Design a protein around this ligand. Structure first.
Ligand code: NI
Ligand code: NI
Ligand code: NI
Ligand code: NI
Lengths: 113, 116, 117, 117, 116, 113
């Protein structure tokens, strides 16, 4: 629009679902459950990626990229971490994507200050 | 928020989309360009429907019969919230967006209570 | 089914999608091919979610407070239908797809009464 | 309607969405509020596209070569239906929504014959 | 590709999605991990449906009656293409993806002919 | 997945539709047509953005960002150009987004060489 309402919480919540699904995949080896878990994980990781991408294209502005010169690469690393989580059943991959999003969330809130 | 049961629900998702609705209403009051007005209408329509989807999901996928027994007004509160969001969708008045936010806040309160 | 409002609602939309869920469940018992099993699982997840959406729309956008007054079990019926569709979503047992259809049929019966008076 | 195949098809899905298109068109003649006009336009674009999708699915995934042999006008009928839905999409005139429903009704008649034999 | 009539159609969109389908089939032959197999099945299902949507759109929104008169086999060619894509969707054999690409290539040829 | 099939042509085709719609908006002042044109433009610009974002997150890799150190900013500029086109009826905005995508397309094809 823009309307100006952004919050990395959207990206965070979806990535939390990714990790939560990967964790459930460890405790239920039923093939149908594993398949559904895979299906859901794939959707949620892609929605998390979309939320991170929207922050980067629609919310962050040149003065933010000036002030935080590592921002472009951080967002790109976050997206690849989400791709790695969606390709894995290991909750450590989910967690890494969450740790990256946390770094974006800090930067975001600093820029609202 | 998609019955795995994965377990992760947060009314923040409904709230953030409804906050977008209200923000767009506020903006439509300030700029009467027809193209902007149209784009605002498009966005508002999509965000309000996303907000309704998140609220519906809490209601069907997160809340359980023990909750509906402990909070007998919850079903109607959810229905009113969805109707408040449809009302905001159809309106440019930010007070309609705020009313939808107020209803979501009541849901959020109950939600965090069931977490405690 | 769009909250314009346009006033075009019909539980047939929920029913068709829930019929698809059950049909997929029945096909999963007839073909153990892992690739087919996975595709069936993909489809069922999608159709079950659309069914839930159609039900939710009827409840939020079609049914009104007089209907809720007149049918005080209706809120809980709609909730049960959605949970039944979630249970079908999570299962290969066509009994679960059937149970969801049974609930939809009950909504369908209320709906058509409200179209008379 | 998913090409699993699950074998659950019904032109009712196309018809309901095309009914919505016409209902929206009729509502646009009754309320000149520019905001309402725009919302009506948003909704109609969406419902018309879903209608086209349902028709296309019946043609690609339900109808088979014997049906095409037996009903040699069917390809062109399906094409005309989709173009009619595009014309409704582009118009506020409910006559266009009606014309699209007329075509769907013709598909519906063929469909149900193929369910008998 | 959405009847404005905006005018911009290119069978490349159908082709690129069908090329993705074939690429995923080829990959499923190389790696029998169940999780990878599932993810490949998910992706293939989505891309094949996108390809079918693009082909359907050319057929309803781009091609006109003069074209169907000049190319009387076009309707059935489109129907066969959609069925070839549904066949690829249901298969792991890259030859099914290639067959769908072959049918799309026939459409693409006719398409560029109507441009000349 | 990845499967490895990427082509900036997807982003290009959608952005071409954006510009084509903006051009049609100049020759038909009917309010219903202007509204539909706005609706369609909004969808196509967002699909173009999604295609550009996917290239940047899923196709480009660290050695590409090393070799082309202007790549992150170019992709970000391309996305904001698409946002500007979706907020405008001026075909010059559509064209600018296309000119940016053209720069990405050149880089893409170099990296396949
Ligand atoms: Ni969930
Ligand atoms: Ni409606
Ligand atoms: Ni089906
Ligand atoms: Ni178009």
């Amino acid at each position: 629009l823009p309307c100006g309402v952004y919050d990395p919480a959207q990206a965070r919540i979806e990535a939390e679902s990714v990790k939560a699904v990967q964790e459930k995949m460890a405790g239920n080896d039923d093939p149908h459950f594993q398949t559904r878990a895979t299906v859901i994980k794939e959707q949620r990781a892609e929605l998390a990626k979309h939320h991170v991408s929207v922050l980067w294209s629609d919310y962050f502005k040149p003065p933010h990229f000036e002030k935080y010169p590592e921002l472009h690469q951080l967002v790109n690393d976050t997206l690849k971490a989400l791709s790695a989580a969606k390709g894995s059943k290991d909750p450590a991959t989910g967690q890494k994507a969450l740790d990256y999003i946390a770094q974006i969330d800090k930067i975001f809130w600093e820029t609202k200050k």
